[PDB]
Amino acid sequence: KEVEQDPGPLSVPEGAIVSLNCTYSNSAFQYFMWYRQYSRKGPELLMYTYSSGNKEDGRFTAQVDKSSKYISLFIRDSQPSDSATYLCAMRGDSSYKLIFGSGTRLLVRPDIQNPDPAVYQLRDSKSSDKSVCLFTDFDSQTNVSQSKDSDVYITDKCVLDMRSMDFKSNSAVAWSNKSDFACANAFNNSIIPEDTFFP
């Protein structure tokens, strides 16, 4: 009663087709269904199928192959709202007990129409001391790596959406209490586009 599933996390661009899948060894498993789990939420049913065949619902197609003992979930035209962990759940007919796979994290990256790569300095409010560098408006085809040492903290990309203006963007943050630390060489260890600024 054990099922295999690569945890990922796989990162794909909005519109990309994605493939998730589990494999198992017990032939007793006769029912299969995919659940979806959003960060800090409970799992929610998404798809389910019996024996061999392929169930298609909108952008999702679920399959199962009892011979290969292999189950898959295809998401076409991946949308940001699809970012979550997908868990395959299976069981036999002698019990309603479900067996789950560890689950795969999928991060589908928002497609930002007009990039404007730039890094800024934000001042501490009231009175605090620790430079805070913002890297923003860069395209989703850009990765943000961790800083060499630990005194310089960095958070991965994050997309915000200003629904009032049909506009969205990314941003990563880097802060440190270290003296030599300054924006401009704040993201050195990351492959960033040509754009950068300085006050």
Added chain:
Amino acid sequence: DAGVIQSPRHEVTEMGQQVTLRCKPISGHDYLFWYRQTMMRGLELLIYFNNNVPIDDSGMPEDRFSAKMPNASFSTLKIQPSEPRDSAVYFCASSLWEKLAKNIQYFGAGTRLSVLEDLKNVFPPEVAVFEPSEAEISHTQKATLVCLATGFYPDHVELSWWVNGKEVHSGVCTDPQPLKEQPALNDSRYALSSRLRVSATFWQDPRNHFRCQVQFYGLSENDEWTQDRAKPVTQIVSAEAWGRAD
């Protein structure tokens, strides 16, 4: 309409103490399952009942864990005494006979449990709001504020932005997870970041008020605390900033 309800949502406690998680399944449903979820073992079934009678307890540990449904609309899961390795998210699920055939279980929002070796490792969060850069406003007719929550443990926190006393989601982005302030140490304090972007004009309005808010889940009333330090209780720490033009 009303889904599965679990309580409490968060639960931070010291080892050796009893912990009681409760769940209320959906009306009508005569099947109730209990699961646990961790990064290492994944989502695991512990026990499930049918009409208040437990059917499968294979996933239950030894007698330290205990479960039951005294009646059809209430179940309980008890750990006595608790231990660090029991830390996890415990989910309650509920279903019917006909739904289980099509394999549909309805899961509750879950209970995050953290059993610690001792409470002296618990610290609430520090919170700072950093103001936008003049360049970002000149280069673009938009202003991005930034919030930073640091030095908190364990990682039970919920950060939110409030604009003029109202919570705003449009133009917000928070770090999916927190990052350890010192990865080296087996345990370590955490930090989380968030950002809020409004239109340059909105930020330049001297009336608009922006406040970053972080809910932390720590100790409670009965939790002992014999140390000269602001008891690290469940609370809300916040930083703020006002709209300005110049």
